[PDB]
Design a protein around this ligand. Structure first.
Ligand SMILES: CC(=O)N[C@@H]1[C@@H](O)[C@H](O[C@@H]2O[C@H](CO)[C@@H](O)[C@H](O)[C@H]2NC(C)=O)[C@@H](CO)O[C@H]1O
Length: 576
């Protein structure tokens, strides 16, 4: 059974929730304006809410930047630890001269928030950083065009870019590893020329930069040539070493793939991606028992693309039967009386009645806040509460967070079947695939709006909507209605597929990145579908295709169509 236990945090009246929200954007503005008195006034009588936690975190980032440490410590003491932002924890630890977090943070080779960047610079200056990892970060920052941060870290390490020592040499290497320099037809030739005067670490990193650029440009032979010159693979950034694995994968070099994976950080080796591909490599080289152990490990990672593929190699088909009962209705009712859950529901229902999309986004924040500490039974109760109130994305948000207790009908909800199934049938596309795409694009939020203006359940861009409307006799603004949105998106799935050799994997990539890109990523030979997906150069699209296709496998199982293994759904991507 599922436990009937629900939280009973103090509830506030709707009026109070709405009054607090009325002041929430101004409180964030007051942080930006450094109006500390106004922020304090907003927080003074605030409920214990995500609104308060969000304002307090943003305030603390500003207080830490401005070195107002007494006010910082006072307010930091009011945040729950699971609620403290990364940059706020870094400012707090810096204020106590505590550099414990540095050992892990320095392994990041990309841009970090200012508080965390400064924590690492302070650790460096006190000799508290691993030298190998510190200089790897300096190199990473140079390659990612974060030159100021690179410069400041090198200085803190005691070897500044103008000091004639290590720092100056790493900076000079920009003639090879720069953003544009790495693309030069002469980059490899220039690196080969200056190589004798470079350290083992600088040479390894620099070939990794060149290999990465080729690999992401899908010049696999050149990528493997340059990556083959990396003598110390642990010097590579995470993105560089994954792109070495991707090149070996694309070339079907199973032994080289297995070798590269074994040099990855443990965190990357234990990812579903590299558990599964190492398993495939062991299988391809006749190591059946090692393959099986790895497939089991990948299948244990839950509800995702590579876990399903790994299960299939083990003879396990997807199974969407729930392994827990429905939550009891009294518990579903009483969950909505918890003060933090209620607050989220108040903001959600008022966002609907009032047509306030910003309010709806804060309602999502209240939901995540309210459910943050929940055990699996409370998550599944709360998922049904959210579904009943029409808060569909939060129903999925809570249901998908479990590990052991699995409710697939709440993980893979299918509202709007009286519209989506018909539109999908009308252009002859698989409705499980459409649902899989909607779940990834909008999580069934009908008015969803991306950072760049993609709109609605299927996240069609306005420029694309205008083009589609011109082809199928619609008006462009029907993009912003549910029924028009589903008609546009399903038609565009079918049209994009028609334009990409009728292949569903290519179509999924083309829907997100444009068909011209999807076609650019094909090879001159056929590719296994999962190999095309894993070697997509755009990180967002690569993630997107795997999620949409895993989603589609789960929906197909709930919908009861004849069984299609995910491996079969991925199939073979044709040669260009
Ligand atoms: C669903 C949606 O709107 N998707 C957008 C993409 O398909 C869009 O790609 C661009 O779309 C146009 C229509 O096919 C093309 O004229 C344009 O060439 C195409 N880009 C190509 C082909 O490379 C991408 C961004 O380009 O964003 C999606 O959200």
């Amino acid at each position: 059974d599922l436990s009937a236990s629900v939280p009973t945090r103090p509830a506030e009246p709707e009026r109070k929730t709405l009054a607090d929200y009325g002041g929430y954007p101004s409180a964030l503005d007051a942080v930006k304006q450094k109006n500390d008195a106004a922020v304090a006034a907003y927080l003074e009588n605030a409920g214990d809410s995500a609104m308060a936690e969000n304002v307090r975190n943003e305030w603390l980032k500003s207080l830490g930047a401005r070195r107002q440490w007494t006010l910082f410590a006072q307010e930091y003491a009011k945040l729950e630890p699971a609620g403290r932002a990364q940059e706020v924890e870094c400012y707090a630890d810096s204020s106590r001269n505590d550099y414990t977090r540095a050992a892990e943070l320095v392994k990041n080779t990309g841009k970090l928030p200012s508080g965390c960047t400064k924590l690492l610079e302070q650790a460096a200056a006190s000799g508290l950083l691993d030298g190998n990892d510190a200089w790897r970060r300096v190199r990473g920052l140079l390659a990612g065009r974060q030159t100021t941060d690179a410069r400041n870290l090198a200085a803190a390490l005691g070897s500044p870019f103008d000091g004639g020592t290590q720092g100056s040499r790493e900076y000079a290497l920009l003639n090879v590893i720069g953003k544009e320099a790495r693309k030069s037809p002469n980059a490899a030739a220039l690196l080969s020329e200056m190589e004798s005067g470079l350290s083992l670490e600088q040479r390894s990193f620099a070939w990794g930069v060149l290999g990465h650029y080729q690999s992401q440009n899908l010049n696999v032979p050149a990528a493997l040539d340059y990556y083959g010159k990396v003598a110390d693979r642990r010097q590579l950034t995470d993105d560089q070493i994954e792109w070495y694995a991707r090149a070996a994968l694309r070339a079907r070099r199973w032994d080289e793939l297995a070798s590269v994976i074994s040099h990855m950080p443990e965190k990357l080796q234990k990812s579903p991606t590299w558990l599964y591909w190492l398993a495939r490599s062991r299988a391809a080289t006749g190591n059946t028992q090692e393959a099986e152990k790895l497939y089991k490990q990948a299948a244990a990672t839950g509800r995702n693309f590579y876990a399903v593929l790994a299960g299939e190699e083990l003879g396990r088909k997807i199974d969407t039967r729930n392994n827990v009962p429905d939550a009891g209705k009294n518990s579903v009712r009483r969950m909505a009386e918890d003060g933090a859950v209620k607050r989220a529901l108040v903001l959600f229902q008022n966002s609907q009645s009032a047509g306030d999309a910003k309010m709806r986004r804060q309602a999502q924040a209240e939901w995540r806040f309210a459910t943050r500490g929940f055990d699996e039974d409370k998550l599944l109760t709360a998922a049904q509460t959210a579904f009943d109130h029409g808060f569909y994305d939060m129903a999925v948000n809570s249901a998908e967070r479990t590990d052991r207790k699995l409710n697939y009908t709440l993980r893979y909800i299918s509202p709007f079947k009286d519209t989506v199934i018909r539109h999908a049938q009308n252009v002859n596309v698989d409705p499980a695939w459409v649902y899989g795409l909607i779940r990834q694009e909008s999580r069934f939020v009908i008015g969803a709006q991306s950072r760049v203006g993609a709109q609605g359940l299927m996240q069609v861009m306005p420029a694309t909507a205008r083009e589609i409307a011109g082809k199928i006799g619609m008006d462009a603004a029907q993009l912003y209605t549910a029924d028009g949105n589903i008609r546009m998106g399903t038609w565009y799935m079918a049209d994009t597929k028609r334009r990409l050799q009728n292949n569903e994997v290519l179509a999924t990539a083309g829907y997100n990145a444009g068909p011209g890109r999807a076609r650019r990523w094909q090879a001159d030979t056929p590719l296994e579908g999962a190999v095309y997906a894993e070697t997509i150069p755009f990180s967002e699209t690569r993630d997107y295709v795997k999620k949409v296709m895993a989603n589609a496998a789960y929906y197909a199982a709930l919908f009861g169509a004849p069984h299609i293994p995910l491996k079969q759904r991925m199939g073979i991507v044709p040669a260009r």
